[PDB]
Design a protein around this ligand. Structure first.
Ligand SMILES: Cc1ncc(C[n+]2c([C@](O)(CO)[C@@H](O)[C@H](O)COP(=O)(O)O)sc(CCOP(=O)(O)OP(=O)(O)O)c2C)c(N)n1
Ligand SMILES: Cc1ncc(C[n+]2c([C@](O)(CO)[C@@H](O)[C@H](O)COP(=O)(O)O)sc(CCOP(=O)(O)OP(=O)(O)O)c2C)c(N)n1
Ligand SMILES: [Ca+2]
Ligand SMILES: [Ca+2]
Lengths: 620, 620
């Protein structure tokens, strides 16, 4: 479609719109007694032009799959986002005044309970990565005409995650993506480092492969023109603005970030702004080309049962890659992402079979998670991210925000625990159960063999929320029949007898150590019950207690993880106060070191001999 | 000192050195059966020139405070680090062959049990930030002549944390810092994005304010020359190299990252490399100018007791800033860092009083933690970092690696829980107890009033490991006398009577809600015991159980945190299986939303009325 070059009346209407957006942002934050009107006001012309000249969207259906996407990365400008959606006719204008109330959904930062919000962005520096996932999806998966626009602050640009996204967009030629940089000189507590050195921003953006245009961010004409040309590259509109623009005596001043105008001041400023508005008539939104495809919503099923053989040996990391590739044959919705670790996590198997649905994210875990979140928005794909579980700690804030975003993403972290051996603690995930259990929407799978791994992948694909699958580096025996039924929140008793003296709960490598301990103890005429949780969250409390009541109330948990936040603590919280129930823990008590896997399991007190000794001490 | 321009014999000796380093890296990784010889070999000339021409250090005292610093950011090149320290005469050459053994300290990645290692770096992208902290300390605190050199991989440069460090170094004019980029074309599982596009690397470095020099990374002469001029800016030596350099048939090839040569191959390659070595004579290290000052090691004490008044109201976030500024008067070792949040965390009070010891880190939490780690190396400073606790999740991998680095840093996270009110969940720390409890060397302080906050700051300053102080946004009453004694692992019973029916454990805002619940329950003739943990890690198990035995075995925990990994789970793990002991939990069950603090405490079931109801249900 051609650019529609606006006339002076349209330009004036866009100015009027910007000023209405300023007034609303002030009114709402003054009413609330909190918020960030000066951060809204620097962005008012940008927002007016995007929503009422450049973008194409259905105003009454913000989630429509054909719409252009807008991501407010500087999420504390939420009041002006709400104001544009009232101006567009979706929100009632009276509701704006209920900003931040417990009776409203116009919360302090944007959240997906709002139809017009796809991702939550209040932790700065994350919106551009989500926008990259949306743009990648638009260009390569949906193959649709929608564009993606992301508004960032200048202080925000200090976050490394932004630059990971910058680099991703140029690697992947996201010529459907526009970043708008609100260069208002100031952050929260001081000027942003570069202030109004517009040329350095341009140099940085260009060095990272973007087409960079410096504009007057308070000129509706310059904005219309800059937004109105498509490029063959991701485009950065570097907008020189003033914080608090239009608020006389606050514009360009320190000490005003996140400070509402008092009521007396708001009334005076609003009258000033209102005196600049030429007409009350509002501009209408323009709708999109409806070329996004249908996506199916059905259950994704593996094409056959697992085909492992009991007693064969495979690492659960390898079983993950096999299972993910298998699942990719059943549905085109499955996509895989990895951070330069595909030959360690075995996501390379998916890449080999389904290359068009694999996204190489390079050594940039933060951005990888954000790409996945963006790809999952509007249910366009079902993503599986992978790296070493230890390196998901690099992305915890992205994961945390993914739950606030109500996102359905799947994460598989390999190389858990000391059982990796020789690389040492930098590579050892010992806190990943703690981290993922603390994520409110999470489901935590810890498969102990290849069969359980395949079933975990299938279940994860069909489970909402943040799904985490913990995989292991070393090879262990297949213990489950291929036709064993697995469910979220259902554990398995893998060894039992009528005279079991302890219930030993292990997972992954420690399950296999517990089975070996049972063989040791047999020599001594001591039987133990062995339980494999399958999911750590939710935990099968019923089977755990039923087991413990069969074994004189005694539970021993053994885990390749630190003591805090892992399996032992989950079990203890589940059962504390149950009469007759005792819980004893074996876990890793300190930062490990290099050695062979078996040597480290021994050193850190979580191998067969440590388990056997703990069982004997219980009994006596 | 002038540059010493090397003769051809010195250059040949540096080539010989590089080749010896290659041979050792191959021998050690072949002996181990794991490791990364091709990543060593690309860096061999760089390492030879740095250690045997450019840097100044005491070879027999690697930790000496006068020494130049070297940071191996690409930590999987550890075998070549070990080899240089054997070449320098510190390590025995035979020990190199014990790489990765449980009987050795030559672990898979560098760790500070090695005298020659200050920070652990195996999680990529973190070394440059630590190096920035070292350089900042050298230039501004020690005011010493040592320089700081940091070797990075090219794949590694995809990490956003690197670019945060890049920007920090130019903001702070770190003209004593050199980054060496090993542009060997390849990452782990594919070519690095930019491959050998040396000009783009240069453009990126220059756009971020560095003086950038492209060199042949296998030319000892070019390296000597590039390293031999100081600049008025941080300097990036952008070295074009080949992965596996010198290994015939492996050089510049895929499928060799992290793969040892077999033994048969190693023998053939080593003979080839050895045939290139002209002389066995080794170059000697050159020592430093001894101009680093004395740093005292004594206990840091507050200059007076707290001066709060019982019944006055202050937020613990404000008490933190007051206490940190006070402590800064007692010792010059205290430094403060903050990520554009100083006016929210109240670290601005320290900045006002001690500006030369405040480091503005901007909106870059990853880098902030790494700067702190670097500043703490060799005990040069005692750093206190602050931001919102929620945003420490952005830096979890840096924190995790700080514990592997045996680092003594202090972190204060504000704005915990739903009690912040209107900003909503993006700002609410609800997983920070889970995260910090999972860090092995951590001490977790949760002060409930201003007095406890001041005492926590003092105790943290004098405590080794990762200290975390959780502060709160709203004002609460002072409840402790100024002369109350506080200790790590010692809780306080703040309300008791002889007929207490439940022990209620709360902290911060929930302690105050528990005290208000006690007043509600009095009306009903029900007394409760109220316990303030002070430290969540370590937990005063003795006082908790002694309390519970006085209150019919009943414990109720109430926390402004998610259920997993917080106070309730810590208490449950501590006491599970104690006869007669029951533990009931109140916590936040899902992602919150905006509202007034009191409204959210109510919505999420952790205010006075929720506590009173849980107590009644126990009793009945
Ligand atoms: C990852 C990260 N790190 C820091 C911050 C804090 N922060 C912002 C807010 O969190 C708002 O989102 C902050 O203002 C709080 O509301 C303050 O709470 P109080 O209780 O003290 O009232 S916003 C911000 C500065 C951003 O500057 P720019 O990017 O330049 O944007 P602009 O406003 O100039 O347009 C900071 C540091 C967050 N949120 N995320
Ligand atoms: C933050 C982060 N993310 C990813 C990685 C993985 N990784 C590296 C290693 O972790 C080594 O430190 C990896 O090779 C493991 O040893 C493999 O374990 P296996 O069990 O599979 O054997 S190293 C690396 C690639 C780095 O490339 P460059 O920066 O270009 O360096 P160079 O080798 O070319 O000089 C990756 C992705 C880590 N560690 N950290
Ligand atoms: Ca700004
Ligand atoms: Ca490389």
């Amino acid at each position: 479609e051609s650019y529609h070059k606006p006339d002076q009346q349209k330009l004036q209407a866009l100015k009027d719109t910007a000023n209405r957006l300023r007034i609303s942002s002030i009114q709402a934050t003054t009413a609330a007694g909190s918020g960030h009107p000066t951060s809204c006001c620097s962005a008012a012309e940008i927002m007016a032009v995007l929503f009422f000249h450049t973008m194409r969207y259905k105003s009454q259906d913000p989630r429509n799959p054909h719409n252009d996407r807008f991501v407010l990365s500087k999420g504390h400008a939420a009041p002006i986002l709400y104001a544009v959606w009232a101006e567009a006719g979706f929100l009632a204008e009276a509701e704006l005044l209920n900003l931040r109330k417990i009776s409203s959904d116009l919360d302090g930062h944007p959240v997906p309970k709002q139809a017009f919000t796809d991702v939550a962005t209040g932790s700065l520096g994350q919106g551009l990565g989500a926008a990259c996932g949306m743009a990648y999806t638009g260009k390569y998966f949906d193959k649709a005409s929608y564009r993606v626009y992301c508004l960032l602050g200048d202080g925000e640009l200090s976050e490394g995650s932004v630059w990971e996204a910058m680099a991703f967009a140029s690697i992947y030629k996201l010529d459907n993506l526009v970043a708008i940089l609100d260069i208002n000189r100031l952050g929260q507590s001081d000027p942003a480092p570069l202030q109004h050195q517009m040329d350095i921003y341009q140099k940085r953006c260009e060095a990272f492969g973007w087409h960079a245009i410096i504009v007057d961010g308070h000129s509706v004409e310059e904005l219309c023109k800059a937004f109105g040309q498509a490029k063959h590259q991701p485009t950065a509109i570097i907008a020189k603005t003033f914080k608090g623009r239009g608020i006389t005596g606050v514009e360009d001043k320190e000490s005003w970030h996140g400070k509402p105008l008092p009521k007396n001041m708001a009334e005076q400023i609003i009258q000033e702004i209102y005196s600049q508005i030429q007409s009350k008539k509002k501009i209408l939104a323009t709708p999109p080309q409806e070329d996004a495809p249908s996506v199916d919503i059905a259950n994704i099923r593996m094409p056959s049962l697992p085909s492992y053989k009991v007693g064969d040996k495979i690492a659960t990391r390898k079983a993950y890659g096999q299972a993910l590739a298998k699942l990719g044959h059943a549905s085109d919705r499955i996509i895989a992402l990895d951070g330069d670790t595909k030959n360690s996590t075995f996501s390379e198997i998916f890449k080999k079979e389904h290359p068009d649905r694999f996204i190489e994210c390079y050594i940039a875990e933060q951005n990888m998670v954000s790409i996945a979140v963006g790809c999952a928005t509007r249910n366009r794909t079902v993503p599986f991210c992978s790296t070493f579980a230890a390196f998901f700690t690099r992305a915890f804030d992205q994961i945390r925000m993914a739950a606030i975003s109500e996102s359905n993403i799947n994460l598989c972290g390999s190389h858990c625990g000391v059982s990796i051996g020789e690389d040492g603690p930098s590579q050892m995930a010992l806190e990943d159960l703690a981290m993922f259990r603390s994520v409110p929407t999470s489901t935590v799978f810890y498969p102990s063999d290849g069969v359980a791994t395949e079933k975990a992948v299938e279940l994860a694909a069909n489970t909402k929320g943040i799904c985490f699958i913990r995989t292991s580096r070393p090879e262990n025996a297949i213990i489950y029949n291929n036709n064993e039924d697995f469910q979220v929140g259902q554990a398995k008793v893998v060894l039992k007898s009528k005279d079991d003296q302890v219930t030993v709960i292990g997972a992954g490598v420690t399950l296999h150590e517990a089975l070996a301990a049972a063989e040791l103890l047999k020599k001594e005429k001591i039987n133990i019950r062995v339980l494999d949780p399958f999911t750590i969250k939710p935990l099968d409390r019923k089977l755990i207690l039923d087991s413990a009541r069969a074994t004189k109330g005694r539970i021993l948990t053994v885990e390749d993880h630190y003591y805090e936040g892992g399996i032992g603590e989950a079990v203890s919280s589940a059962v504390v106060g149950e009469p007759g129930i005792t819980v004893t823990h074996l876990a890793v008590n300190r930062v490990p070191r290099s050695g062979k896997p078996a040597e480290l399991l021994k050193m850190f007190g979580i191998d067969r001999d440590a388990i056997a000794q703990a069982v004997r001490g219980l009994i006596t």
